[PDB]
Design an enzyme around this catalytic site. Structure first.
Site, PDB file in Angstrom:
ATOM      1  N   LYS A   1     -26.788  10.656  17.453  1.00 12.32           N
ATOM      2  CA  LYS A   1     -25.917  10.801  16.321  1.00 12.32           C
ATOM      3  C   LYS A   1     -25.031  12.000  16.536  1.00 12.32           C
ATOM      4  CE  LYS A   1     -28.792  10.592  12.846  1.00 12.32           C
ATOM      5  NZ  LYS A   1     -29.972  11.099  13.601  1.00 12.32           N
TER       6      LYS A   1
ATOM      7  N   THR B   1     -24.589  13.883  19.175  1.00  7.89           N
ATOM      8  CA  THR B   1     -23.840  13.764  20.383  1.00  7.89           C
ATOM      9  C   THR B   1     -22.611  12.858  20.205  1.00  7.89           C
ATOM     10  OG1 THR B   1     -25.706  14.313  21.740  1.00  7.89           O
ATOM     11  CG2 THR B   1     -23.993  12.914  22.711  1.00  7.89           C
TER      12      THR B   1
ATOM     13  N   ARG C   1     -25.239  19.629  10.516  1.00 10.31           N
ATOM     14  CA  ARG C   1     -26.350  20.466  10.083  1.00 10.31           C
ATOM     15  C   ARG C   1     -26.680  21.510  11.133  1.00 10.31           C
ATOM     16  NH1 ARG C   1     -30.934  16.294   9.664  1.00 10.31           N
ATOM     17  NH2 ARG C   1     -29.744  15.382  11.423  1.00 10.31           N
TER      18      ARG C   1
ATOM     19  N   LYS D   1     -38.079  18.343  20.440  1.00  8.14           N
ATOM     20  CA  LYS D   1     -36.822  17.602  20.511  1.00  8.14           C
ATOM     21  C   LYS D   1     -35.658  18.518  20.865  1.00  8.14           C
ATOM     22  CE  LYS D   1     -36.080  17.569  15.501  1.00  8.14           C
ATOM     23  NZ  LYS D   1     -35.471  16.954  14.285  1.00  8.14           N
TER      24      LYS D   1
ATOM     25  N   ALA E   1     -34.544  14.785   7.875  1.00  9.37           N
ATOM     26  CA  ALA E   1     -34.342  13.582   7.055  1.00  9.37           C
ATOM     27  C   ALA E   1     -35.624  12.800   6.866  1.00  9.37           C
ATOM     28  CB  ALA E   1     -33.261  12.701   7.626  1.00  9.37           C
TER      29      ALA E   1
ATOM     30  N   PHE F   1     -32.107  11.349  11.251  1.00  8.23           N
ATOM     31  CA  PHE F   1     -32.834  10.199  11.775  1.00  8.23           C
ATOM     32  C   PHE F   1     -32.114   8.857  11.492  1.00  8.23           C
ATOM     33  CE2 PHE F   1     -36.164  13.532  11.130  1.00  8.23           C
ATOM     34  CZ  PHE F   1     -36.338  13.818  12.490  1.00  8.23           C
TER      35      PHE F   1
ATOM     36  N   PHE G   1     -26.555   5.339  28.102  1.00  7.54           N
ATOM     37  CA  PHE G   1     -27.377   6.347  28.749  1.00  7.54           C
ATOM     38  C   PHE G   1     -27.254   6.153  30.239  1.00  7.54           C
ATOM     39  CE2 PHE G   1     -30.282   9.271  26.432  1.00  7.54           C
ATOM     40  CZ  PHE G   1     -29.896   9.003  25.135  1.00  7.54           C
TER      41      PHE G   1
ATOM     42  N   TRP H   1     -20.950  11.180  26.042  1.00  6.92           N
ATOM     43  CA  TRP H   1     -21.907  12.105  26.671  1.00  6.92           C
ATOM     44  C   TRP H   1     -21.419  12.570  28.021  1.00  6.92           C
ATOM     45  CZ3 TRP H   1     -25.153  11.935  31.174  1.00  6.92           C
ATOM     46  CH2 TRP H   1     -26.060  13.015  31.275  1.00  6.92           C
TER      47      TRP H   1
HETATM   48  N1  LIG Z   1     -25.797   9.127  26.352  1.00  4.10           N
HETATM   49  C1  LIG Z   1     -26.713  10.095  26.599  1.00  4.10           C
HETATM   50  N2  LIG Z   1     -27.292  10.261  27.809  1.00  4.10           N
HETATM   51  C2  LIG Z   1     -28.203  11.228  28.068  1.00  4.10           C
HETATM   52  N3  LIG Z   1     -28.594  12.121  27.120  1.00  4.10           N
HETATM   53  C3  LIG Z   1     -28.086  12.056  25.870  1.00  4.10           C
HETATM   54  C4  LIG Z   1     -27.092  11.019  25.520  1.00  4.10           C
HETATM   55  N4  LIG Z   1     -26.754  11.169  24.221  1.00  4.10           N
HETATM   56  C5  LIG Z   1     -27.510  12.220  23.783  1.00  4.10           C
HETATM   57  N5  LIG Z   1     -28.271  12.751  24.780  1.00  4.10           N
HETATM   58  C6  LIG Z   1     -29.225  13.847  24.696  1.00  4.10           C
HETATM   59  O1  LIG Z   1     -30.357  13.240  24.053  1.00  4.10           O
HETATM   60  C7  LIG Z   1     -30.789  14.050  22.943  1.00  4.10           C
HETATM   61  C8  LIG Z   1     -30.515  13.429  21.573  1.00  4.10           C
HETATM   62  O2  LIG Z   1     -29.147  13.507  21.203  1.00  4.10           O
HETATM   63  P1  LIG Z   1     -28.724  13.845  19.664  1.00  4.10           P
HETATM   64  O3  LIG Z   1     -27.228  13.791  19.530  1.00  4.10           O
HETATM   65  O4  LIG Z   1     -29.389  15.182  19.405  1.00  4.10           O
HETATM   66  O5  LIG Z   1     -29.456  12.623  18.847  1.00  4.10           O
HETATM   67  P2  LIG Z   1     -29.732  12.779  17.225  1.00  4.10           P
HETATM   68  O6  LIG Z   1     -28.517  13.459  16.712  1.00  4.10           O
HETATM   69  O7  LIG Z   1     -29.771  11.342  16.680  1.00  4.10           O
HETATM   70  O8  LIG Z   1     -30.999  13.559  17.106  1.00  4.10           O
HETATM   71  C9  LIG Z   1     -30.085  15.375  23.160  1.00  4.10           C
HETATM   72  O9  LIG Z   1     -30.840  16.139  24.106  1.00  4.10           O
HETATM   73  C10 LIG Z   1     -28.768  15.016  23.825  1.00  4.10           C
HETATM   74  O10 LIG Z   1     -28.237  16.151  24.548  1.00  4.10           O
HETATM   75 MG   LIG Z   2     -28.954  14.996  15.286  1.00  5.02          MG
END
Ligand SMILES: Nc1ncnc2c1ncn2[C@@H]1O[C@H](COP(=O)(O)OP(=O)(O)O)[C@@H](O)[C@H]1O
Ligand SMILES: [Mg+2]
Ligand SMILES: Nc1ncnc2c1ncn2[C@@H]1O[C@H](COP(=O)(O)OP(=O)(O)O)[C@@H](O)[C@H]1O
Ligand SMILES: [Mg+2]
EC number: 6.3.4.3
Lengths: 554, 552
Positions: A70, A72, A93, A104, A272, A300, A380, A408
């Site tokens: 989210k 990201t 946030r 996490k 959340a 979440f 990913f 990403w």
């Molecule tokens: N496409 C991707 N490929 C690899 N890692 C990612 C990707 N998107 C997010 N991440 C990593 O995975 C984790 C979760 O991303 P995040 O944006 O924090 O999800 P959320 O906001 O839903 O908790 C973070 O460590 C982020 O840096």
């Molecule tokens: Mg988040």
């Protein structure tokens, strides 16, 4: 290339500049170094009667422990829009300190879609969580001093619901006995701590409109009851003035930026699963005066964050979300189709097919609030090209607008397809936003509404503790409050075990809390805890800093 | 005339910084009126000359305080009014006491540091950094017990407490880890107040972030079942702890109401911890100024001895002068006048209580730094009483000056400022420490108790004996000592006023601060977490759509 490697190598505009590029005047900015600032509440006040820009929410499917993207994605979409030349802002946030040292990690994004200065943002930032923690805990201390100084108000200390707070994952403070040592040293009682971001004090910060409002909400917070069952509040104890004082700066929202220098507010950080999951109203309504488009995240999956964004935040703000983006991943949909968490780097075409039901339901659920969706496929590094078209294909086949997002790995230019799609829907499918339930319903009816309409359970069970509490709260006249459900993020059910779209099940509320100051009710379900713990190998062990640069922060 | 009502008057700290020869890219702003200064300032100036170091200490206090801070600030403004390039170094106030009894620690009347409300609350978040580094360590200790306890820590010997910067009596003794196998391992602990944290002590004695980190690693949290010590290093916490301190380590620049520069850095109390501001701030300020005024907490028996035997020792400072703050109301108390009667005139009681100041004057003489009494004049002070004291002091014969710094600002501190200059110009100091590190723990306790407090000797509870033996056994015999003890008396008994004779100190508990590098004997009944009073100042604190209504 590691997130901190690239966060530390970033190239930032001074925020005073970004501030000025938004119609914010020099004396309305308070700097915390060149790259961070706090914006006055006068900004929003002086613009009260000016029109809003568009409001775009990002939510997601049901996550794995690492999370989908989210944040990201929110960042990347924002960078993409800036690259189509739009006057845009993200609201996010503030990450809780604790999880950076456990599990996490931080919440500043990923790869080339991050907010920066990242290590400030993930750690102490501008001191907001600390201000929450001290106002929260000052209240507790005052409650305990009261008992000690003759207990004038006749509080039954075995009913005190006000807990302490610290911003770490410390499972050893969940359940504690306090006030020991004898008559010089307090009154023995059972309590414990929650994580500071789950504090009601943070909830108040996130729902208030300015200091004096925050002060009034503080004074309505209920801490416990007398021996004869009369409620005792923070205002009965004259704490709100001090509490407000300690939040004097924390009330103002914080301006930072993305890696591509797009402006970003960060303000308030409730989870959340165990709190209401949104950034402050104050940040979001300010941003809507300053930008034509505002991206914002709820915590979440959409069963939790999105639901509470609509039914609590939007409700109390008068916001009318124009579009909503649902983040999905191959990794997660495969998990929802049978693949274990240790086997997700493997291709599996069927496990994505039968995993899709999960997203199927989140789309359905958003549709119920009347705002148009676009799915974001967060590709990913391991996702195969074939898995990636199938998901695209399934989303189209379901009717839903879709777009692949390589934000990403590529930053804002990884998000053009997606950004056009959002723009497309703002221009061509207007939103019809409305809440799921009205305030005049019973607590138990509101709970059953969310239970059945969103999680898809058959109904809801109540322990006797919960029944006793609901009685108490309706009879005391807090029956009209909205409901912030505490539940696991890992399932539509309250069983973290039920993957996918579980059917024919029941949610069980074991405990009901009252947030009379923030103005909502919190039915706690399944086994979810209000303070989380550290793992066998906490991130902390791998964390370090030398004569300049940091490793192990994520 | 209300303290907080002087929320008027300032200039940008960036101007103040450039005016001390600090470069723009060494200043980190927290609003236009507070900053953090890089450690590169001291580093690049390492080989330049030190200014004069002036300590301000005091007599044995009334619970209200006798005016060290108020005087340190006044003195600084007065020196500036004499055309001197001067700085104050102060401790950051603990947040707790602003809601308690005694208030913040920004000074008084027209001698205050500003922005007061910030300085007394969250300031630049140093205390919060301390709190989270300490408590993250505590959290890792407990997690470790929970995840199989591989190191075999006996949870019942854990000395590492948790910390929070509030006066919370109910967190003194607690039981955590309750609720079953999923929720931790049950154990007895509690909290100390954050400013009394070993992490704060380390911040206050370290020279940079990598020094601080190595100190963190040496911190002993408890023991295995066979008595092997276990450290923060063994648990790999020092990197995270240091990360959380990355900004706390840089000292803070603010100012005085008359715009004189001021460093505020480190907060430890003098009754319960070592009572001085950071070395970093003091040594830096010595490079930027010809004159550096700095305070140590409570009476000279506590803060002065510690500034001398711990701070000065580890820093290589040689103090040039020392100011002893005295007040009429306090001397009267010590001469037998009850707390409630200290507004009323009473010369004889003032003559009698002089003994207290007399002993503090002697005690300062044993470190070999010359002394100047500041008589800090309160609105209730009679003309007769202020004269009696001055006469008493010169007949002692210490140098004296009346100070009206509170009511008048720097103008009120001219006679005092003059005398201090006069001491620095003619009577140079011959600083020496009270004791050598080669002694045993018990010998160092006994030097301090005998020579400074005036005790006949020292008693140890069995627990204290065990602890001292354990620390000698483990190699920490050579550490200096930071006595914990009531501020209200030379003795460990808070009701023994004046200059008590024929008494004994009893140490009931001994802590080891292996990372700060000292040992803490806890004496009499003193607690390391204070409590809130009947009517806390919190009850009268408020803020409207702008104005604040209590700082005290
Ligand atoms: N496409 C991707 N490929 C690899 N890692 C990612 C990707 N998107 C997010 N991440 C990593 O995975 C984790 C979760 O991303 P995040 O944006 O924090 O999800 P959320 O906001 O839903 O908790 C973070 O460590 C982020 O840096
Ligand atoms: Mg988040
Ligand atoms: N001359 C004075 N007249 C009235 N009040 C004073 C005077 N000097 C100090 N105070 C006040 O008394 C309290 C203690 O003074 P302070 O400088 O904190 O002494 P200490 O540093 O020894 O505690 C503060 O509230 C301060 O403003
Ligand atoms: Mg002081």
């Amino acid at each position: 290339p590691s997130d901190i490697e690239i966060a530390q190598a970033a190239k930032m505009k001074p925020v005073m500049e970004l501030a000025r590029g938004l119609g914010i005047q020099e004396d309305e900015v308070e700097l915390y170094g060149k790259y961070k600032a706090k914006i006055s509440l006068d900004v929003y006040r002086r613009l009260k009667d000016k029109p809003d820009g568009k409001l775009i929410l990002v939510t997601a499917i049901t996550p794995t422990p690492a999370g989908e993207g989210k944040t990201t994605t929110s960042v990347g979409l924002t960078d993409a829009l800036a690259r189509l030349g739009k006057r845009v802002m993200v609201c996010l946030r503030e990450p809780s300190l604790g999880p950076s040292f456990g599990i996490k990690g931080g919440a500043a994004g990923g790869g080339y879609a991050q907010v920066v200065p990242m290590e400030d943002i993930n750690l102490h930032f501008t001191g907001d969580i600390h201000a929450v923690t001290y106002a929260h805990n000052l209240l507790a201390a005052m409650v305990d001093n009261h008992l000690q100084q003759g207990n004038v108000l006749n509080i039954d200390p075995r009913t005190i619901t006000w807990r302490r707070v610290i911003d770490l994952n410390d499972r050893a403070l969940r359940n504690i006995v306090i006030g020991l040592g004898g008559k010089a040293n307090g009154v023995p009682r059972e309590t414990g701590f929650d994580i500071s971001v789950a504090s009601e004090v943070m909830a108040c910060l996130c729902l208030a409109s300015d200091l004096m409002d925050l002060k009034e909400r503080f004074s309505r917070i209920v801490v416990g009851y007398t021996y004869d069952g009369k409620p005792v509040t923070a205002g009965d104890l004259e704490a709100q003035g001090s509490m407000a004082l300690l939040m004097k700066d924390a009330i103002k929202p914080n301006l930072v930026q993305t890696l591509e220098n797009t402006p970003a507010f960060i303000h308030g950080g409730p989870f959340a699963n165990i709190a209401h999951g949104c950034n402050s109203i104050i940040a979001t309504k300010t941003a809507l005066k300053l930008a034509d488009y505002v991206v914002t995240e709820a915590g979440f999956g959409a069963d939790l964050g999105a639901e509470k964004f609509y039914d609590v935040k939007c409700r109390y703000a008068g916001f009318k979300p124009d579009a909503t983006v649902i983040v999905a991943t191959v990794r997660a949909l495969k998990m929802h189709g049978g693949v274990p968490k240790s086997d997700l780097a493997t291709e599996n075409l069927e496990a994505l097919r039968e995993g899709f039901a999960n997203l199927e339901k989140h789309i359905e659920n958003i549709g119920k609030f009347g705002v148009p969706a676009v799915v974001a496929i967060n590709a990913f590094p391991t996702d195969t090209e074939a898995e990636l078209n199938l998901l695209y294909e399934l989303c189209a086949k379901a009717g839903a607008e879709v777009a692949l997002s390589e934000v990403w790995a590529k930053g804002g230019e990884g998000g053009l397809e997606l950004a056009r799609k959002v723009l497309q829907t703002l221009e061509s499918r207007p939103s019809n936003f409305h809440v799921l339930y009205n305030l005049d319903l019973s607590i138990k009816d509101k709970i059953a509404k969310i239970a059945t309409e969103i999680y898809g359970a058959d109904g809801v069970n109540y322990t006797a503790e919960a029944d006793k509490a609901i009685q108490r709260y309706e009879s005391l006249g807090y029956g009209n409050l909205p409901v912030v459900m505490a539940k696991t993020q890992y399932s539509f059910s309250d069983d973290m075990t039920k993957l996918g779209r579980p059917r024919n099940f029941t949610i069980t509320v074991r405990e009901v809390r009252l947030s009379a100051g923030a103005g909502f009710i919190v039915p706690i379900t399944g086994a979810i805890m209000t303070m989380p713990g550290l793992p066998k190998r906490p991130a902390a062990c791998n964390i370090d800093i030398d004569a300049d640069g940091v490793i192990t922060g994520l």
